Amino acid sequence: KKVVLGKKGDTVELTCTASQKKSIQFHWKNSNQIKILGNQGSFLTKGPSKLNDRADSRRSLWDQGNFPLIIKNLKIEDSDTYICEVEDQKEEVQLL
Amino acid sequence: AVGLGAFILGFLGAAGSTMGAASMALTVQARLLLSGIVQQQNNLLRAPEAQQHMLQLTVWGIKQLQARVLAVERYLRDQQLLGIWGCSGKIICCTNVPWNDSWSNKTINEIWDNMTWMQWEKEIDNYTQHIYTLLEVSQIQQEKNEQEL
Amino acid sequence: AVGLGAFILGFLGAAGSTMGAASMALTVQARLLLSGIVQQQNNLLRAPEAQQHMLQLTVWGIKQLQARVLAVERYLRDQQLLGIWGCSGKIICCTNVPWNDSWSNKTINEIWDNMTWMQWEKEIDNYTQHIYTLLEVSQIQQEKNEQEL
Amino acid sequence: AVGLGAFILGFLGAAGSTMGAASMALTVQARLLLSGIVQQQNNLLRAPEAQQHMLQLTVWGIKQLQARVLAVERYLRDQQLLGIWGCSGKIICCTNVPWNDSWSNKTINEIWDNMTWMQWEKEIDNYTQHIYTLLEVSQIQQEKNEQEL
Amino acid sequence: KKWVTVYYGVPVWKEATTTLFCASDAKAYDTEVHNVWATHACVPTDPNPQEIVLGNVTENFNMWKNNMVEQMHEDIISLWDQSLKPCVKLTPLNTSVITQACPKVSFEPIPIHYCAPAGFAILKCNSKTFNGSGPCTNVSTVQCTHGIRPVVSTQLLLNGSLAEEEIVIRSENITDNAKTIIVQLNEAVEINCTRPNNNTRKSNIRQAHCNISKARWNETLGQIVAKLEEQFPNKTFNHSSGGDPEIVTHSFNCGGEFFYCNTTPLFNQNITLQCRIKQIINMWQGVGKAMYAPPIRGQIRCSSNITGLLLTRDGTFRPGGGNMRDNWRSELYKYKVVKIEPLGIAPTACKRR
Amino acid sequence: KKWVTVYYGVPVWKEATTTLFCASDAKAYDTEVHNVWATHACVPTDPNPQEIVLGNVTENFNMWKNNMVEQMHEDIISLWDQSLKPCVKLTPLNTSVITQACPKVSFEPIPIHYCAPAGFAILKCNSKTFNGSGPCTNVSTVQCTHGIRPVVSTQLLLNGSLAEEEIVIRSENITDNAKTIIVQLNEAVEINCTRPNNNTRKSNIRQAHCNISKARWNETLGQIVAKLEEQFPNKTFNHSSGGDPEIVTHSFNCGGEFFYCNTTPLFNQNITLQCRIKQIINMWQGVGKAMYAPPIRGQIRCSSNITGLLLTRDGTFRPGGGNMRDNWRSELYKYKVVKIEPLGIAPTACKRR
Ligand SMILES: *[C@@H]1O[C@H](CO)[C@@H](O[C@@H]2O[C@H](CO)[C@@H](O[C@@H]3O[C@H](CO)[C@@H](O)[C@H](O[C@H]4O[C@H](CO)[C@@H](O)[C@H](O)[C@@H]4O[C@H]4O[C@H](CO)[C@@H](O)[C@H](O)[C@@H]4O)[C@@H]3O)[C@H](O)[C@H]2NC(C)=O)[C@H](O)[C@H]1NC(C)=O
Ligand SMILES: *[C@@H]1O[C@H](CO)[C@@H](O[C@@H]2O[C@H](CO)[C@@H](O[C@@H]3O[C@H](CO)[C@@H](O)[C@H](O[C@H]4O[C@H](CO)[C@@H](O)[C@H](O)[C@@H]4O[C@H]4O[C@H](CO)[C@@H](O)[C@H](O)[C@@H]4O)[C@@H]3O)[C@H](O)[C@H]2NC(C)=O)[C@H](O)[C@H]1NC(C)=O
Ligand SMILES: *[C@@H]1O[C@H](CO)[C@@H](O[C@@H]2O[C@H](CO)[C@@H](O)[C@H](O)[C@H]2NC(C)=O)[C@H](O)[C@H]1NC(C)=O
Ligand SMILES: *[C@@H]1O[C@H](CO)[C@@H](O[C@@H]2O[C@H](CO)[C@@H](O)[C@H](O)[C@H]2NC(C)=O)[C@H](O)[C@H]1NC(C)=O
Ligand SMILES: Cc1ccc(-c2ccc(NC(=O)N3CCC4(CCO4)CC3)cc2)cc1
Ligand SMILES: Cc1ccc(-c2ccc(NC(=O)N3CCC4(CCO4)CC3)cc2)cc1
Ligand SMILES: Cc1ccc(-c2ccc(NC(=O)N3CCC4(CCO4)CC3)cc2)cc1
Ligand SMILES: *[C@@H]1O[C@H](CO)[C@@H](O)[C@H](O)[C@H]1NC(C)=O
Ligand SMILES: *[C@@H]1O[C@H](CO)[C@@H](O)[C@H](O)[C@H]1NC(C)=O
Ligand SMILES: *[C@@H]1O[C@H](CO)[C@@H](O)[C@H](O)[C@H]1NC(C)=O
Ligand SMILES: *[C@@H]1O[C@H](CO)[C@@H](O)[C@H](O)[C@H]1NC(C)=O
Ligand SMILES: *[C@@H]1O[C@H](CO)[C@@H](O)[C@H](O)[C@H]1NC(C)=O
Ligand SMILES: *[C@@H]1O[C@H](CO)[C@@H](O)[C@H](O)[C@H]1NC(C)=O
Ligand SMILES: *[C@@H]1O[C@H](CO)[C@@H](O)[C@H](O)[C@H]1NC(C)=O
Ligand SMILES: *[C@@H]1O[C@H](CO)[C@@H](O)[C@H](O)[C@H]1NC(C)=O
Ligand SMILES: *[C@@H]1O[C@H](CO)[C@@H](O)[C@H](O)[C@H]1NC(C)=O
Ligand SMILES: *[C@@H]1O[C@H](CO)[C@@H](O)[C@H](O)[C@H]1NC(C)=O
Ligand SMILES: *[C@@H]1O[C@H](CO)[C@@H](O)[C@H](O)[C@H]1NC(C)=O
């Protein structure tokens, strides 16, 4: 997996991508399979979890096939792993 | 007139002629066409030209084509339905069912030279189904025999 | 529905039937039509009638004919493309390439009576190109041999 | 362009090619089509859409169909007119009239490989009627002989 | 014995794609967006439908892998761009911003149906029960679809078709807690949304109320639960999680105005939703923002039929939305385009000569 | 060996004649002669041209023996007789004289193209260099021609097509000193002909001036000479010899008025030609004379493109004219109508049985 280490009390950007270079449906989930973020075509939605707030993406890069998860006001308690749901490319990353 | 299609219309003018004459006439026209001696002219509508008067030629333009398209489908259909009697893909199909003198006790010269198709198909109309049944049977037996070698 | 042409539409209703049943059904309808027992009805549009409403029937009048004309061209095209396998001008073409049990190890009764064409063409789909290649080769060899006498 | 029909248009592009190449090209396209490798695209008009602009597509919609329908009738007609030479239902018909060196004293390799159809049909144009007459005669003699057994 | 025989006229179809065309009952004289669009974009409707039922044919359909959906998407995105022009449009190209004149226009969606080009036909699933995928045991062939009114909305789908007998829960994977569940109702529920002409006050002119029957809502939701319990028998419909306002609230466009409605009264007589008319809209057409002209003075209302819901579940099914392709899937789920491949082969008891 | 084989589908054409039809962008609401004629005479233009290039086909064309030319002649003579009706017409039948009402009409030629009837197609010569006859080495097939604006003029041909790369000198026999040489320019030269609304004086009301650039005229004529010198390298464009006024001066019809212009300033900035508007016209339609109504009060002008010349040489190439069929040849030179004869024969290595 890809592991990204911050300074705990700051921000992290984890990323999922698609080779299509198109905006496609995607989701981000934690290790308990709880939704964090995802889209609905052009629209951004939030997941009903501990990361429902303090989180966003980059809508402008969705057409480049780049679907990031940005967590703000980051805490050590957020250092879980995350699963990408882009196409069938279920890649894993870890936040530290 | 129209509504019958080119296949029928090119044969229909022979309705008043004898059976023999009709066969000869078809042979001659085919020869002249194959050789490039004569040409077939069209009898199709010109299409509307003026928008304000277009109903006159789009109604009849479409109906004329519908008649021709259906004539083509009927022609092509029959050409394969005839596979049952072993006559698919043909205009003239000679088979192995012998003629019964009971259907009509006449010679072939009498039939082909002194009669028209309009008369011939009335004199033997009540045997049409008998003959058609026999044609199917003969084809079945031929297929049976060929596949035994 | 429409868009396929009469050739396909008259066969399409057999899509839910077995292969054997489909062949029998076609034979029966051909018999009834050749004998003058049944008639084929038309399903073509009436044409506009009223000028102010004509777009409704000239658009669909023309599209319906386009579908039929293209169906005729496809039918006639395939009937001659099949010359390669020695099957031109035919609906049912029997050839000399033997069936491989590796393509499908089933009897002909199992295939023709317990299966539909929709299933049959899936079970052997990965051999279609193999078989087609062999059909061409067989036809070439037959032509080669006939022309040596 | 248009006005000739799909039968001609699919062959017309070979007008600048040799006779041999034309035969090979037709064989290849037929193989690709039978195998489901390539597909034929349509070049037909979309029909009016807007009532106020409909003259533009009903005039040409109808004319395009008329051209195709007539092409079908000519194709089907010739396919049976050729019964006279014993070539009905065929694209390539081999017969028993020998070639005369007086019509053209060339080998078949020279004719098929170094010439186009446009040239070939000019070099022997003055023998066309002679040959056509002989083709009919040969067919008559074959029929005569078969019916004597 | 067992020789190859070639058969022509084999009734076998394969799935195919094509440049499928639209048809509608367009008028060209009423100035309304759909009827000044469809008059150049679509043809008159099919005057003679065939509905051929194909015996006992069983066909595998998949509403989530269909292509007709993309084609509907392209026509609707063209329709909106060519009509409901924003005053300000911002596309993330640095950005690229353009402005346009903003005449207001009437906006009332009409049913539009898709029709097969010559050489093609559309197979339709006629099962009363069909979950969106797998074999459908009753198949008919048509040239044109039923007709879909291109309502663009989130959370609740308005003016679509009904399931007739039962509420049908359709999902690509009902247990992956990712995909949106499309709930098709077997009954419609009326919703009456009004902005009365007395709201002339400004900081008001942007407030509207939507009235929903309690009896109808309660019966519908009880029926939905009865089906949800078959799939999830061990558990006993909640607030949205948040996100862009088009997802969070219910949204729709009527009269050219963009309405956003609070649905917590529905998911937790005359239940009223608080609605607002907004000018800054997040586009569904792609990523970007757009400004529309301010509200029309007068009384604007629409009465719509709730015919389905978009619900989601995590790892209490919440209203969801966006991804307009899914609204169209809810209507196109029963159709696929096929071509006929008449040439086939089979072993037989015959040989040549 | 070497047996006759009959082949069907042989891609061979032969030249043929047929009742070729016209098409144009006719309007039916602007009262103008061509657009109130073409609306009943011609169909809408071809919405879908094919331009099929026939490989390496070489075809023998002959612009002077073509039939499309006669067909264009019949439609144009019908057009003029049905529109620009003279007040007095004298045909040498003793003579037969008729009179007609003379409403004046707008007269502005529009391009009209000719289209093949079903069963036929038109071959087109696509060579950049083609002298009007003999083999053309780049041939394509079309249904309809480019479109010819039926300008009826002498000496200088207006609003035709250009040769694109070089000035082309075309003549049936460039050395017989009898036939008219058609010079197609690769560049157009603008001519501005005006009768200002201050010419209200009478014996004036019939005077007009045509303004030609010196720079453009001199370059064009130098280029023409460069080609004439290839054919005639030993010699180094003169006054017309005389004859009917339509030949002697340049003539054309615009706005319904018949203009005659003195071209000696061109063949010997702002070169001006003295022009007069006349009422007694020698018909091009056949032998006879006709009177037209007197000039319109107001300002009448036309700006035309010089696209070619008609020159002659005796036993200093002079402007020529008349014989309207030749103006149409200058546009129809690249087209011929053919039919396909699909049945052919060849020797092969096969036999029956
Ligand atoms: C589901 O389907 C139903 C139909 O079954 C849809 O309901 C219809 O919705 C439309 C749009 O809101 C509504 O249309 C209006 O009807 C009014 C009847 O009086 C018209 O007056 C009104 O036209 C005015 O507004 C337009 C713009 O909004 C202007 O373009 C137009 O020129 C008119 O505007 C002038 O007049 C008004 C009034 O005096 C004034 O305020 C303005 O300033 C201006 O001077 C529309 O035509 C239909 O009546 C509804 N149909 C029914 C049966 O109720 C429903 O929208 C669909 N659901 C979804 C989500 O799409
Ligand atoms: C080569 O092609 C070019 C185009 O690219 C051609 O040039 C055009 O030529 C026409 C004809 O001369 C000219 O049309 C006129 O335009 C005027 C614009 O103001 C119109 O006013 C005028 O109409 C009047 O005259 C008509 C008859 O001549 C009448 O029938 C009509 O009712 C009008 O007459 C009334 O009004 C006038 C003016 O007040 C008054 O004098 C009358 O008494 C009466 O009351 C024509 O429509 C085009 O404008 C030219 N186009 C361009 C771009 O310049 C050229 O002719 C072609 N060459 C050849 C040889 O054919
Ligand atoms: C397959 O679907 C068709 C279409 O809905 C069913 O046929 C319809 O039945 C109703 C009565 O319930 C009639 O009013 C319609 O006229 C029928 N339509 C057609 C085209 O026939 C059909 O019964 C269904 N078959 C199965 C096995 O479910
Ligand atoms: C034969 O003529 C055609 C038609 O002009 C030539 O093809 C065109 O070439 C231009 C570029 O110069 C393209 O823009 C056009 O789209 C082409 N048209 C078509 C129909 O293909 C062609 O190159 C010429 N061939 C020869 C050998 O001269
Ligand atoms: C759509 C359409 C299809 C087919 C036809 C058609 C035209 C002419 C014939 N010719 C014929 O029947 N003949 C009799 C038998 C003979 C003598 C030895 O062979 C040749 C001449 C057949 C079909 C017309 C239109
Ligand atoms: C444009 C068009 C062209 C052709 C057709 C057409 C119609 C019916 C058949 N019939 C058939 O396929 N059968 C099977 C084989 C059999 C049993 C022994 O022979 C006869 C019956 C074929 C083509 C329709 C439209
Ligand atoms: C209305 C219409 C009717 C028929 C056609 C048509 C299309 C293609 C062919 N094909 C062909 O001529 N070939 C040459 C011979 C060969 C090689 C061994 O067999 C096969 C390929 C024929 C007719 C088109 C339109
Ligand atoms: C004619 O019909 C009779 C029965 O009435 C039958 O015995 C005889 O064989 C038939 N002849 C032919 C040629 O079919
Ligand atoms: C079946 O395929 C095998 C090769 O895998 C070949 O040896 C055998 O002869 C084939 N049988 C038939 C009937 O084609
Ligand atoms: C060629 O024509 C001559 C008559 O000029 C004839 O004697 C000879 O038999 C013909 N040969 C063939 C192959 O037809
Ligand atoms: C459906 O979702 C479950 C739960 O995440 C998963 O185990 C299963 O593999 C998925 N099936 C498919 C076909 O995606
Ligand atoms: C909406 O108003 C109509 C009368 O126009 C009424 O029949 C319908 O029941 C109302 N719907 C609701 C939800 O109140
Ligand atoms: C919604 O219900 C309230 C109930 O007090 C009523 O006053 C209001 O007029 C209703 N609104 C609509 C649009 O029916
Ligand atoms: C609906 O209004 C309540 C306050 O009554 C608020 O707490 C809730 O978040 C609002 N819901 C939406 C979807 O806007
Ligand atoms: C749900 O909405 C109804 C609307 O009538 C309200 O009375 C009820 O208290 C709400 N319940 C919850 C848990 O928000
Ligand atoms: C939704 O669920 C949360 C618990 O996760 C609860 O606190 C909240 O009140 C519920 N809201 C509604 C409208 O049911
Ligand atoms: C709901 O609104 C209707 C009018 O649309 C009214 O007749 C009815 O009394 C209202 N119901 C309640 C509870 O206010
Ligand atoms: C809602 O459904 C009823 C039938 O129950 C129908 O009469 C009404 O027109 C429908 N309304 C809309 C907007 O589709």
Ligand SMILES: *[C@@H]1O[C@H](CO)[C@@H](O)[C@H](O)[C@H]1NC(C)=O
């Ligand atoms: C062309 O003209 C010259 C000169 O008068 C003459 O000798 C020659 O025979 C002519 N050629 C043709 C084909 O007319």
Ligand SMILES: *[C@@H]1O[C@H](CO)[C@@H](O)[C@H](O)[C@H]1NC(C)=O
């Ligand atoms: C004719 O006038 C136009 C302006 O309308 C000008 O561009 C053109 O060069 C002029 N032509 C001549 C020969 O003066």
Ligand SMILES: *[C@@H]1O[C@H](CO)[C@@H](O)[C@H](O)[C@H]1NC(C)=O
């Ligand atoms: C022609 O040129 C002269 C130059 O003196 C100028 O006065 C006159 O206006 C020009 N005429 C036109 C129609 O351009």
Ligand SMILES: *[C@@H]1O[C@H](CO)[C@@H](O)[C@H](O)[C@H]1NC(C)=O
């Ligand atoms: C042109 O005018 C001159 C006088 O300046 C005259 O000699 C000449 O013959 C005239 N040319 C024509 C063709 O009218």
Ligand SMILES: *[C@@H]1O[C@H](CO)[C@@H](O)[C@H](O)[C@H]1NC(C)=O
């Ligand atoms: C030819 O015409 C020009 C016009 O500008 C004039 O200046 C020149 O003198 C003329 N030459 C002859 C030989 O007439």
Ligand SMILES: *[C@@H]1O[C@H](CO)[C@@H](O)[C@H](O)[C@H]1NC(C)=O
């Ligand atoms: C034309 O040539 C003659 C000699 O034949 C000469 O006298 C006359 O001046 C020339 N005219 C022009 C305009 O070049």
Ligand SMILES: *[C@@H]1O[C@H](CO)[C@@H](O)[C@H](O)[C@H]1NC(C)=O
């Ligand atoms: C030619 O006419 C144009 C206007 O059409 C004018 O601008 C230019 O100066 C004139 N040239 C001469 C030499 O008079």
Ligand SMILES: *[C@@H]1O[C@H](CO)[C@@H](O)[C@H](O)[C@H]1NC(C)=O
């Ligand atoms: C003359 O040619 C130019 C292009 O160089 C074109 O724009 C103009 O419209 C043409 N004029 C006429 C009358 O054809």
